[PDB]
Design a protein around this ligand. Structure first.
Ligand SMILES: CCCCCCCCCCCCCCCC(=O)O
Length: 133
């Protein structure tokens, strides 16, 4: 299952191309400004087979809980209401969100003790790097 090394609190330390990823998602300028400045924490926890990923920032807080492989409804930081599924593939937590005939993917993997989130929307790619607090 998910490596226990995912568990704990992560702090954003670097990000590339997040503005364009937000643009692709239909996020407006005022909110993109927050997104490009914010350095959120991401808290990952688990109870039984339920994984929880909480994101905390002044910009916005979000929280999802899920079982691997099972679709759930999600409200995203930019207020999209999506049908989402997270699966584990070769160590990576692969989140797919679907809404309005659109889809985006966020893959989270552990690389060199960091958590690397790779986000893709119609060919626009960003990467966000987190360090463990
Ligand atoms: C919490 C991020 C900053 C808030 C900006 C408002 C919402 C726009 C961004 C929507 C998608 C966020 C995906 C984040 C992926 C990650 O966990 O690094």
């Amino acid at each position: 299952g998910m490596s226990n090394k995912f568990l704990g609190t992560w702090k954003l330390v670097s990000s590339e191309n997040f503005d364009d990823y937000m643009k692709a998602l239909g996020v407006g300028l005022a909110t993109r400004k927050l997104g490009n400045l914010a350095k959120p924490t991401v808290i990952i926890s688990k109870k039984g087979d339920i994984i929880t990923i909480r994101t905390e920032s002044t910009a916005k807080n979000t929280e999802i809980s899920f079982k691997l492989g099972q679709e759930f409804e999600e409200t995203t930081a930019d207020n999209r209401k999506t049908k989402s599924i997270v699966t584990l593939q070769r160590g990576s937590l692969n989140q797919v969100q679907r809404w309005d005939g659109k889809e985006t993917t966020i893959k989270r993997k552990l690389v060199n003790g960091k958590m690397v989130a790779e986000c893709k929307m119609k060919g626009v790619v960003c990467t966000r790097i987190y360090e463990k607090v």
